[PDB]
Amino acid sequence: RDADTKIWNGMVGELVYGKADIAIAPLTITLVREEVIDFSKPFMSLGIS
């Protein structure tokens, strides 16, 4: 989410704006994304290594 213009940009911004129906992509689940779009249960487990 952009700080200056308060707009979502990226795959999430495409999902909010109705252009894309779903995002089957390597997208990390975070709090700010969960507020604006809905996620499934995570399909991959990853961490800093």
Binding site: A20, I24, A25, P26
Partner: peptide, 10 residues
């Protein structure tokens, strides 16, 4: 017909 957005990351 469903639009599946994605990114090119290997």
């Amino acid at each position: 017909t469903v639009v599946v957005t994605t990114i090119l990351e290997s």
